[PDB]
Paper text:
GECIs are prominent tools to monitor [Ca2+] in defined cells and intra-cellular compartments. To create a red GECI, we selected the red fluorescent protein (FP) mRuby (an engineered variant of eqFP611 exhibiting high thermodynamic stability and monomericity) and replaced cpEGFP with circularly permuted mRuby in the GCaMP3 scaffold. To aid our protein engineering efforts, we sought to solve the crystal structures of mRuby, RCaMP, and R-GECO1. High-resolution crystal structures of mRuby in several states, as well as a structure of a Ca2+-loaded RCaMP variant, aided optimization of the red GECI scaffold to useful performance levels.
Author numbering: 39 to 136, 163 to 222, 226 to 448
The structure:
Amino acid sequence: SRRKWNKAGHAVRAIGRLSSPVVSERMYPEDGALKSEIKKGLRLKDGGHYAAEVKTTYKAKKPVQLPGAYIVDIKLDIVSHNEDYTIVEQCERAEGRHAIIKEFMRFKVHMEGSVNGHEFEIEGEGEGRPYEAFQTAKLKVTKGGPLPFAWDILSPQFSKAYIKHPADIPDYFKLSFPEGFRWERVMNFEDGGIIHVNQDSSLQDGVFIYKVKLRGTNFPPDGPVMQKKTMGWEATRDQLTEEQIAEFKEAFSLFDKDGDGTITTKELGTVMRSLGQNPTEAELQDMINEVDADGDGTFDFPEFLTMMARKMNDTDSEEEIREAFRVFDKDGNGYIGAAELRHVMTDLGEKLTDEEVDEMIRVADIDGDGQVNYEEFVQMM
Ligand SMILES: [Ca+2]
Ligand SMILES: [Ca+2]
Ligand SMILES: [Ca+2]
Ligand SMILES: [Ca+2]
């Protein structure tokens, strides 16, 4: 009965999270530069997390309007690679939230660097849609291959022009062209490994030209970077208990109505329209892209668990519970009545009997007025 409340509450919070993806890069103006922080670290093959801190300074080559502080969601995937990673394909979509850069742009990149004293060069070519929010690139190790460390340390080094910015957030990167921009970056990792990166971005002949210089040092030789034990960048996650996994499985089942192990944009659209929302099919698609961790073009249960485990501060946990309450509290009068509850459960796809609805109210109603107020809801969730 309490389980029924948690099933429903988790599903509504899932919709909330699907509609609000973790920040990837936090942007902030400072000292005449646009700076950023990234708190994502690296998922290890053993399931653990290898923490990183990444600080970047971006600086246009001519004076350009700085924006106010904002957020970039970025999803980067390794689309393919040869056996030893000397040739790699990656792709990414990026979006900012609170004439010469054409609709379609190609780029060329050249990296030279060193990690624990291992010198290498990479040459690459990419393309995408700078306003739409999409890019792909093919990278090839031209010297020092095969690389004796995780590709993941290089992937975020290879394209800021390809970030969709809304109209009221100045696009520092796009506005800097044709002359372009430089960046500098420092990454610290939890075992003391360090990487300094310098980048130059310009526009020649209609093509973006990227130059990168990277120097990594102090990685332990048995550590996960030098032993290739990493699997992509991920945000910090909480550990889930066995019970929670059970709960979240039930919440998942309300979306996956056909039972195929996968949630689709159709299945998600269906629950979201019953709930009275109407997101556009571009939007439903974006929502699944952001949580499709393996990039196989489906949203499955382990990926649903990842979303539900993302580490969130207490302001933010509390806001999401407030938000869940507002969905159940259809009229917004601060009380969930029987009829409001029945309708939300039906909307979620839990068909319930009158008496089951009564027991749900009965178990949540501390003060006995026949409705559930916010404090009583919190107690449930
Ligand atoms: Ca399904
Ligand atoms: Ca997937
Ligand atoms: Ca109400
Ligand atoms: Ca009550």
